[PDB]
Design a protein around this ligand. Structure first.
Ligand code: F3D
Ligand code: F3D
Lengths: 246, 246
């Protein structure tokens, strides 16, 4: 079980779970101002979501939950998870966002759609902050799993007994990831005082990732994408897998 | 200076800084369905904001900042600060929100304005979570000061030298409040492992306070309050105080 893993085993499992880095799908032989920036980002997000599902299934503790709860967690967290990935990719690219290895965009390119450049600047400031802190890959995968488990855990509909059991388990997994972060920091030599300070600096950036997700979601809902299968159904379909290909 | 305070001195200073608990201003001899719920909450928020300014000036480190930066921090954080106060007041009132000692409202009373009951439920879930964790008053005042200092620190416009110095100072104050939280938890007997776990559980709730603030702000902007002095000017006026009454 998730709750019996050691720190190194948690880290190994999170590292192995990482999704691939995907490419934007545009014709690189054709001009750039043809392309719709929102169309490129939308297509990229849709492909990435399928992989995110595979990733979340490999995060220790996640497939112990109900499919209803798995859907709820991913529905709450998907844009934060995309965003923390984006910021992490972009750390060593000051002033730009690496949406994909063929789609590295600066501030100005942000202006194409009224909205983004606000978000674009928030994302660059976050990447900058991670660069300052010298965020490690092992710390990053802990933080991204924390988002997955934490973002939706305060908005479950019910206090059924099953729901109380599900919340307790989520909170126990989160405690194991905190232990794992502390173990990483100790292993790299920081003092106890530096350990707690760094833990707090990393978790406080998660508040800013939430903010950015909310600002982006505000824009996405305003696009008004007239009757399509709701996100929970699509999540349910990808999550509600059969086992015929095992 | 803020940076030279001990933990006990930080806690004492935060406890002494606490604003008063204000009452809603309605005629308690007259019927309830006369009153506009949004009008009551709006009036309450406006009075509370003046006191919040006084409070923020007493948070160690805050008046070392530029008035521009003080405005920016409060402009980002004011609704989170109101909300964490609300949740704290409501902990020992299961199923209700204590907006004021004469304005304790349940879920159903939330429904008066299309919007709130969504937010209302998030706020009740947060109060419940604090009740579960058995949040202390000393921990609460640390968390509320963290919101004040953290919420806006990733969205400063500039990297002027003065701005870099201001960010470094904010980050040093935040590190002192983390040390203070850890000292509280140690003083109350928790193990080192429990210390870090509790630190993470408290800071992750701040992500949910951000979310709720954003959902509320979405509603407030949609009200479309046609040309009034912008919030930054009003903040500037209360913050940009003379010293003639010293
Ligand atoms: C930060 C940039 C950004 C991104 C973004 C994300 C999602 C977007 O689309 C929402 C989905 N609508 C389609 C619904 C139909 C459907 O699902 N089907 C038919 C299967 C669009 C953009 C985006 C896209 C890809 C990314 N990789 N990493 C990060 C990242 C981010 C963005 C977000 C909000 C506003 C503006 C821009
Ligand atoms: C959670 C409930 C909630 C609250 C709320 C907060 C602020 C509100 O008004 C915004 C200000 N507009 C006036 C602008 C003009 C001006 O400033 N001048 C002329 C000086 C309204 C409500 C509220 C009010 C008082 C509170 N105590 N503690 C918490 C708390 C919260 C709420 C927030 C958003 C949507 C729905 C409800």
């Amino acid at each position: 079980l998730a709750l019996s893993l050691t720190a190194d085993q948690m880290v190994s499992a999170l590292l192995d779970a990482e999704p691939p880095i995907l490419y934007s799908e545009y014709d690189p032989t054709r001009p750039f101002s043809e392309a719709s920036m929102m169309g490129l980002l939308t297509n990229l997000a849709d492909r990435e979501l399928v992989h995110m599902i595979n990733w979340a299934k490999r995060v220790p503790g996640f497939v112990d939950l109900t499919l209803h709860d798995q859907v709820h967690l991913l529905e709450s967290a998907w844009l934060e998870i995309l965003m923390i990935g984006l910021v992490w990719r972009s750390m060593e690219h000051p002033g730009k966002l690496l949406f994909a290895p063929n789609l590295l965009l600066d501030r100005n390119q942000g202006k194409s759609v009224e909205g983004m450049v606000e978000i674009f600047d928030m994302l660059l400031a976050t990447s900058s902050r991670f660069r300052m802190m010298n965020l490690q890959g092992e710390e990053f995968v802990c933080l991204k799993s924390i988002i997955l488990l934490n973002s939706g855990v305060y908005t479950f509909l019910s206090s059924t007994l099953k729901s109380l059991e599900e919340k307790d388990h989520i909170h126990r997994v989160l405690d194991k990831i905190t232990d794992t972060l502390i173990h990483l920091m100790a292993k790299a030599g920081l003092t106890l005082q530096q350990q707690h300070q760094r833990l707090a600096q990393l978790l406080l950036i998660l508040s800013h990732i939430r903010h950015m997700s909310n600002k982006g979601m505000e824009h996405l809902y305003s696009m008004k994408c007239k009757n399509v299968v709701p996100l929970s159904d699509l999540l349910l379909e990808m999550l509600d897998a059969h086992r015929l290909h095992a």
